[PDB]
Amino acid sequence: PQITLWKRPLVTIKIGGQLKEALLDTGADDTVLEEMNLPGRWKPKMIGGIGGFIKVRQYDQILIEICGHKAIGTVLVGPTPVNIIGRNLLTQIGCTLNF
Amino acid sequence: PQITLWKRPLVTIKIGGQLKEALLDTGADDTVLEEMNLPGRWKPKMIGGIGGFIKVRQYDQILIEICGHKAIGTVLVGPTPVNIIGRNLLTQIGCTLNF
Ligand SMILES: CCOP(=O)(COc1ccc(C[C@H](NC(=O)O[C@H]2CO[C@H]3OCC[C@H]32)[C@H](O)CN(C[C@@H](C)CC)S(=O)(=O)c2ccc(CO)cc2)cc1)OCC
């Protein structure tokens, strides 16, 4: 598909058996999801953006389905205001910017 | 062009007659550039990100050239960690997401 940018590029994702709405974000290196208690090991991390840093839990090799396209990678979980799909997963679904 | 996301989508921009590097950021509503001197009126504004809010200077109807494509729109200037081109200007240059 093609997604115009008049509105936020929000799409449905499937993760850890749950459906959620997330932002396709070319400005995020990594994927940051709202608080959810996913099973398995995790490592503490701090990620910074506008306004400073927040503490997140880094889970590795997490599967996520993004509009029917599967991707497997690192997911950071924490008090993010929005579910953010970053480049680590956008690359796997073949997403590009075009103008 | 078509820009893949294996690397950060950084491009050269031209603003106020100066060249800079900026990130094409589909997760940003607005365009926020690091501290710099622009001519003309500006108004104080606040914008929020992953880590909280920052104070910026809002410059309206600013000419900016992004990877060779012209835009005239709002530019916020302030303590952003990196220059980000948001949707307000990405739409003007005809940028879309595709997978
Ligand atoms: C708390 C109240 O904030 P809030 O609810 C908004 O919440 C939001 C918070 C974040 C975003 C996404 C970010 N966009 C953003 O900063 O945009 C600003 C300017 O345009 C406005 O539009 C939306 C916000 C304003 C950006 O795409 C991605 N970032 C990196 C860039 C900064 C490059 C360093 S990152 O997320 O920091 C980040 C860092 C590290 C990792 C791990 O690799 C992953 C993600 C969108 C909405 O309301 C406020 C309007």
Q: Count of CB atoms within 10 A of residue A22's CB?
A: 22
Amino acid at position A6, single letter: W
Find the residue in A nearest to B94 (Cα): A99
Question: How many angstroms away from the CA of A88 is the closest CA of chain B?
Answer: 8
Catalytic annotation, residues of B: 25
CA distance A36 to A94: 26
Distances (CA, A) of B86 to A56, B28, B30, B71: 25, 5, 4, 12
Query: Contact at 8 Å (CB) between A88 and A27?
Result: no
Domain coordinates of chain B in residue numbers?
1-99
A65 Cα distance to chain centroid: 11
CA distance B75 to B35: 11
Question: How many angstroms away from the CA of B35 is the closest CA of chain A?
Answer: 14
CA–centroid distance, residue B27 to ligand 1 (Å)? 6
Q: What determination technique applies here?
A: X-ray
Give the resolution to one decimal, in Å: 1.9
Q: In the β-sheet with A96-98, what is the strand arrangement from edge to edge?
A: A2-3, B96-98, A96-98, B2-3
Greatest distance between any 2 Cα atoms in chain B: 40
Indicate the residue of B2, B51, B54 with minimum beta-carbon distance to A96. B2
CA–centroid distance, residue A37 to ligand 1 (Å)? 23
- Residue A3's H or E segment, with its range, is strand A2-3
